[PDB]
Design a protein around this ligand. Sequence first.
Ligand code: A1CKD
Length: 167
Amino acid sequence: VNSFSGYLKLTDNVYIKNADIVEEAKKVKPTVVVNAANVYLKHGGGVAGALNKATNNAMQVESDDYIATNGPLKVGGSCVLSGHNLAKHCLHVVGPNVNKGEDIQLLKSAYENFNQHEVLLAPLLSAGIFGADPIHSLRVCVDTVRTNVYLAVFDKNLYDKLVSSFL
Ligand SMILES: O=C(O)C[C@@H](NC(=O)c1ncnc2[nH]ccc12)c1ccccc1F
């Protein structure tokens, strides 16, 4: 039992809510919040810009040190950093950005990173300004992630569309 509230059950292990991931994180303080990162951990907009803003830019400062030491992530890859005031840990996951021309095929690899964590609060990878088909991303999520994932979808119209079209 956990303290995630008001989520619609999609499958055995995947739940979904129309919510701001920042506010969900502030309430639940999950062990892991997922960031929809890019390979440089430059947290500008969407999920990443919002999470980073909520940390007062501490996420960005930490991320810049990570990149200076380790170099960029891979598309489809991830790293574990602090969750700051939002969660114990932040799992920065790089889904493909279709608006950068990146291969949507890498989305499954991106979701596989979630399987290293028993429970996660996460956005829908590659959706929104990452330019992928969100119905497809939700399908890949449910068909790839085996651990317990609580999805926070920001856009109300998108949430309604995702629920109404989910198989
Ligand atoms: O609408 C959506 O769910 C899709 C969108 N999600 C969010 O940006 C988002 N999601 C939850 N909480 C949030 N709080 C502030 C922003 C935010 C999205 C997902 C992945 C990458 C980019 C992107 F734009």
